[PDB]
Design a protein around this nucleic acid. Structure first.
Ligand SMILES: [Cl-]
Ligand SMILES: [Cl-]
Ligand SMILES: [K+]
Ligand SMILES: [Mg+2]
Ligand SMILES: [Mg+2]
Ligand SMILES: [Mg+2]
Ligand SMILES: [Mg+2]
Ligand SMILES: [Mg+2]
Ligand SMILES: [Mg+2]
Ligand SMILES: [Mg+2]
Ligand SMILES: [Mg+2]
Ligand SMILES: [Mg+2]
Ligand SMILES: [Mg+2]
Ligand SMILES: [Mg+2]
Ligand SMILES: [Mg+2]
Ligand SMILES: [Mg+2]
Ligand SMILES: [Mg+2]
Ligand SMILES: [Mg+2]
Ligand SMILES: [Mg+2]
Ligand SMILES: [Mg+2]
Ligand SMILES: [Mg+2]
Ligand SMILES: [Mg+2]
Ligand SMILES: [Mg+2]
Ligand SMILES: [Mg+2]
Ligand SMILES: [Mg+2]
Ligand SMILES: [Mg+2]
Ligand SMILES: [Mg+2]
Ligand SMILES: [Mg+2]
Ligand SMILES: [Mg+2]
Ligand SMILES: [Mg+2]
Ligand SMILES: [Mg+2]
Ligand SMILES: [Mg+2]
Ligand SMILES: [Mg+2]
Ligand code: NA
Ligand code: NA
Ligand code: NA
Ligand code: NA
Ligand code: NA
Ligand code: NA
Ligand code: NA
Ligand code: NA
Ligand code: NA
Ligand code: NA
Ligand code: NA
Ligand code: NA
Ligand code: NA
Ligand code: NA
Ligand code: NA
Ligand code: NA
Ligand code: NA
Ligand code: NA
Ligand code: NA
Ligand code: NA
Ligand code: NA
Lengths: 337, 53, 132
RNA sequence: CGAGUGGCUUGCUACCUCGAUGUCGGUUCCCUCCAUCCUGCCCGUGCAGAAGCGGGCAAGGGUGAGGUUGUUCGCCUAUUAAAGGAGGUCGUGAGCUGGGUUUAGACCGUCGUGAGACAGGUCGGCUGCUAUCUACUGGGUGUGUAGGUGUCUGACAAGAACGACCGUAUAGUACGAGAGGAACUACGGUUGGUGGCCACUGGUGUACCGGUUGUUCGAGAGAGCACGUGCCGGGUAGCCACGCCACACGGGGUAAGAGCUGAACGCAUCUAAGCUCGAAACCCACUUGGAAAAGAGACACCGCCGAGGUCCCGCGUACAAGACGCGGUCGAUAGACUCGGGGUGUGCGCGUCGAGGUAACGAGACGUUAAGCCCACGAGCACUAACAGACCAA
RNA sequence: GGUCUUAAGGUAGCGUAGUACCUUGCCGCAUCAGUAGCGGCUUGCAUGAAUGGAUUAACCAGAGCUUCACUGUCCCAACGUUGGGCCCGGUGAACUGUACAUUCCAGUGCGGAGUCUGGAGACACCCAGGGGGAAGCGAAGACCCUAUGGA
RNA sequence: GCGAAAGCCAAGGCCUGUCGGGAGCAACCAACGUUAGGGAAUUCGGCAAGUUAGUCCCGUACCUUCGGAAGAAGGGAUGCC
RNA sequence: GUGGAAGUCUGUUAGAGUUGGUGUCCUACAAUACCCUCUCGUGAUCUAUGUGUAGGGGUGAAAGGCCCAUCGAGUCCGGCA
């Protein structure tokens, strides 16, 4: 009869090709609810350890009790909104209008950009306001970049640059909010955007694995029984029926696996601190020591240690926030042994 | 808690508790201990063991 | 059912021979099915602690032998994870024959029982000698 | 009784192939159909309730595990929300299998004078090929758009990214003589699928450390071989799953259906014009890809005698070539060294004890010694090596 | 039926048989469930006495079945080892080739088309892959029929 | 050591079972090791793999052509000084 | 107790054989190979050399097996265009 069975692997994360930017790019942003604010931040993955927590869930029969929870440590030092980009609404979607930059630049931002030497901030600002007057102003986002230098364990000094949306009350109000952030020096921090307890969406470029078989890549079976000894162990039965006489792209085949962007949904921010309270004895394997601004993320995060990961207020949360959870213990035990 | 085998403190959110036939309970801090036990060895006779120490 | 209050890695399969932790006259039990469980092509139906399984008596009193009854998984060799992170495993795998209302067919439960089993099967629990 | 639709079965035909289109069943992997088994929304009921029975829309998802048989089919068990059917050369042998079919050997029964025969049964009985083209999965080099860096846009494309069940409160309530026994809603968990991750458990770990057999290097010490670890005990990192994390709701328009207003037809009428609702289905939402979108895009800055890039050197968050990413003395990129953090499990030597033995000798025990040995990780540290320098470029 | 064909008319045994069409025969054992296996029954489509019958200790790379033990056969795969595979120097074939050839969906056609017709898609080249298609390559089909063929 | 067996080593012979260099050296394949819990659920069928194992002591069923079955089965021991 | 029989047992002694893997190979190392597995191994045994039997004839513990990669009638040349 041939029993039924779901297909192997999702056809939603394709094509399974190597990512274009190691730095993730959100294709979604939260809704314009609260007061004006930057809708995202970034850090650099460091590692894992567990934390003991007080059951924060009001519906848990264990609410108030001890509870061990896995946590991935992420160094989230301050970042810098170096300019405000404006978009206009056109018959072909949104298009970048202009940009308002600054003069105070991080000593090493030029390892990536051809830093500006002559820019007219006001004119840009004007152009934007005239577009808003005309009513063609599309959302507003800030060009942001990180300060790798600020993170010793991470070799790179060349900053990673990524655009982040600014959703606020009115457009006029948040437009201003934008300009103000920028004008200063763009300097902002995880505290300014997130609060321990809230849910965030963590994007990242997964750990690369090179070319792999379908078994690993799509999760197809290995030849079973007598079939496994005939000369085929990890190759599927066939590439398709006789007709249509062509191999469909839906059939699991070998290829690039890993080093793909993924936006993992609803990640609870256990704690946002600073210092070396989360670091492990011996140091974070293949990473280093943590002693500065950090975020503790519940569970796992895509990517290997040292990789840049991006945060964003969960766009589709299931639970209501349960602010500042009681941390009763953070394990610093060595990750070697 | 303490390892009912070697005697060192068992890092919270770690370890295994074996439940014996009779109903006795034995918390272990690591596989190393567990395994040395299954060999029939006693913590006292193992110099690395806090107990023996 | 009700949350077990612990994560389980089924240690049993359809066809597994376990111990009958009670005085019903049934010594050895053979798993035949798992209540409320549907698998997936080629996968053997798996059972673990706190699962109500269908069983058949392999060993015991002539009168109890070959009988197809219902039971509950009181102990297993494969570890299980409690909220505080610790793991818990037992010396063997055992189940206690139960009836329609989930009341132990027997009078006395031999050997210990996981606590988690309590939160699901009261009358079984309230019959336990030792509850870990 | 009458009219049909399908092209799964069978039969008929003899159009196609006999310079061969590898015949069953199964398996694996992919797509589809709807005449729908479950799941969603509905109608009727010989619809009190609960459980059903029949019917409508509907193919998003699911539709599983086993006992005999080569079997398909089917018979049977226990689970289940249900364990639907069919198409793809009765999908799938340049994929597998070879039980059966179907050669040569042999036996039995039947038939035959006999050779030998039987879609009767039975035991045994082989599975070739280095991929030219095309197709697709992934990876690169070029050209076009017409100097560079960084950030984007989004025509379109993929998705099931989610499907389903159990439990609790509702409630022993509505309903019902009683037996029995719901729901809306809110919660907790399971399962299957999906993507990721490795603190925890677990596996590996022919890195490592110890034990120990045989033999050889005279003994000792320290070693080699015993398949690519002699065997045994432990096991770091990493990789993993049996481990862990995450995977809506809600809008919009509809089907079946329930209605509103409403005429043809003064009445009536859910429809004819109009309108309000209403499916797990559709669109959006969400995730992934995506300037080669020939309307070949946008913005900011840098530059056209110089912006930027390639080669080079030290390396990897990358990797089959190629590609990608980081660092290069204005430096911690790699190694050495020392710490830290880890794995083993207490080194050589010497001292004491030691069943004994005249003595020689003596397996072994204790001390020195958390020792000895070892590390794919972290830190400190410019000591060594990231030097020298080449090239392209409007 | 209570002899007739053709001489006799199946005795001892064995029997759903490696012989039983009906057939998964019926009952039992065994299992959750057993077209299997074993035992009994047995009218045997179409058993049976040197065409030897029944039966049998020992023996068996002979056929079927059950149990204990065991286990990566499986659930469901992971990690590792060695040789390859990949890159480089050197050496250096074969198969195969009417032509053209970036195809895909349909249609049509000697009714199983990369080449016809209609549309869709498609910038060129290259590397690796597992083999969907070229009714892929290999063999003037062993099957079947035909020949006033052969043995 | 039972041994003309294994394994290790002499004497003697050889590095000519005659192409090399490089990538922690990917997918895939050939030989192979180890795999938690379960333990034949796999499959026509336990195919493949695994289990057992040398020696001594105890002990040994049905059946039988009295020869055998039998190393039945099962239980214990096993080093060094 | 002695004795030491056996188309006797174990047995990769030598040697002979070839059950399964339907593994490896399958333009091979090879026009029948490699590996593991498996059987026999004092006898109807295995083996070298010599020697006999020749084509409708041999030889055959019988498979239409074998008679120089040739067998339900060898090979060569001729009949033969
Ligand atoms: Cl298979
Ligand atoms: Cl089942
Ligand atoms: K034909
Ligand atoms: Mg094969
Ligand atoms: Mg660790
Ligand atoms: Mg530990
Ligand atoms: Mg199957
Ligand atoms: Mg073909
Ligand atoms: Mg319909
Ligand atoms: Mg569909
Ligand atoms: Mg077919
Ligand atoms: Mg099919
Ligand atoms: Mg073939
Ligand atoms: Mg094929
Ligand atoms: Mg081939
Ligand atoms: Mg056969
Ligand atoms: Mg057969
Ligand atoms: Mg046969
Ligand atoms: Mg060696
Ligand atoms: Mg019978
Ligand atoms: Mg006679
Ligand atoms: Mg055309
Ligand atoms: Mg012919
Ligand atoms: Mg013929
Ligand atoms: Mg003739
Ligand atoms: Mg195992
Ligand atoms: Mg079976
Ligand atoms: Mg099966
Ligand atoms: Mg075998
Ligand atoms: Mg003999
Ligand atoms: Mg022998
Ligand atoms: Mg001779
Ligand atoms: Mg013959
Ligand atoms: Na093969
Ligand atoms: Na093989
Ligand atoms: Na085919
Ligand atoms: Na018709
Ligand atoms: Na032909
Ligand atoms: Na087939
Ligand atoms: Na459907
Ligand atoms: Na069946
Ligand atoms: Na065909
Ligand atoms: Na084949
Ligand atoms: Na086939
Ligand atoms: Na709707
Ligand atoms: Na372009
Ligand atoms: Na006769
Ligand atoms: Na024989
Ligand atoms: Na294995
Ligand atoms: Na092909
Ligand atoms: Na005598
Ligand atoms: Na052989
Ligand atoms: Na002749
Ligand atoms: Na002639």
């Amino acid at each position: 009869p041939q029993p039924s069975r779901p297909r192997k692997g999702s056809l939603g994360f394709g094509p399974r090709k190597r990512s274009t930017s190691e730095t993730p790019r959100f294709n979604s942003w939260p809704s314009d609810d609260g007061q004006p604010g930057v809708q995202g931040f970034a850090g650099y993955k460091a590692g894992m350890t567990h934390v003991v927590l007080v059951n924060d869930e009001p519906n848990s029969p264990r609410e108030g009790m001890e509870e061990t929870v896995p946590v991935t440590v992420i160094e989230t030092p301050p970042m810098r909104a170096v300019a405000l980009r404006a978009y206009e609404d056109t018959p072909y979607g949104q298009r970048p209008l202009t940009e308002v930059w600054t003069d105070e630049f991080h000593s090493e931002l030029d390892r990536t950009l051809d830093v500006p030497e002559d820019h007219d901030p006001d004119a840009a600002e004007e152009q934007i306001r005239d577009a808003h007057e005309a009513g063609d102003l599309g959302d507003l986002r800030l060009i942001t970049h990180t300060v790798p230098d600020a993170v010793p364990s991470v070799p790179k000094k060349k900053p990673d640059v990524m655009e982040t949306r600014v959703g606020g009350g009115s457009v006029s109000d948040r437009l201003d909010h934008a300009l103000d952030i920028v004008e200063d020096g763009g300097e902002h921090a995880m505290n300014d955007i997130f609060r321990a307890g809230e849910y965030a969406d963590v994007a990242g470029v997964t750990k690369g694995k090179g070319t792999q078989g379908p078994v690993k890549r799509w999760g197809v079976q290995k030849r079973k029984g007598k079939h496994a000894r005939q000369g085929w162990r990890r190759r599927i039965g066939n590439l398709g029926p006789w007709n249509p006489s062509r191999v469909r792209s839906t059939v699991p085949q070998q290829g690039q696996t890993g080093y793909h962007q993924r936006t993992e949904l609803n990640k609870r921010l256990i704690d946002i601190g600073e210092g070396d309270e989360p670091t492990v004895d011996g140091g974070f394997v293949n990473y280093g020591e943590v002693d500065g601004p950090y975020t503790l993320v519940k569970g796992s995060v895509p990517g290997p240690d040292k990789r840049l990961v991006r945060f964003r207020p969960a766009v589709r949360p299931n639970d209501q926030p349960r602010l500042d959870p009681e941390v009763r213990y953070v394990s610093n035990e060595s990750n070697q042994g | 808690r303490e390892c009912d085998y070697c005697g060192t403190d068992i890092e919270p959110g770690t370890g295994t508790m074996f439940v014996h036939k009779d109903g006795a309970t034995t918390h272990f801090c690591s596989s190393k201990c567990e395994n040395n036990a299954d060999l029939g060895r006693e913590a006292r006779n193992l110099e690395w063991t806090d107990t023996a120490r | 059912m009700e949350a077990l209050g612990a994560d389980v890695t089924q240690g049993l399969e359809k066809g597994s021979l376990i111990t009958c932790a009670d005085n019903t006259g049934a010594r050895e039990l053979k798993v035949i099915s798992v209540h409320g469980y549907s698998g997936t092509k080629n996968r053997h139906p798996k059972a673990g602690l706190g699962d109500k399984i269908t069983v058949s008596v392999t060993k015991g009193t002539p009168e109890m032998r070959r009988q197809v009854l219902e039971a509950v998984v009181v102990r297993q060799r494969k570890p299980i994870r409690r909220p505080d992170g610790t793991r818990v495993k037992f010396e063997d795998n055992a189940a206690v024959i139960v009836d329609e209302n989930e009341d132990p067919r027997g009078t006395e439960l031999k050997g210990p029982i996981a606590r988690e089993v309590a939160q699901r099967f009261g009358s079984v629990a309230s019959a336990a000698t030792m509850i870990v």
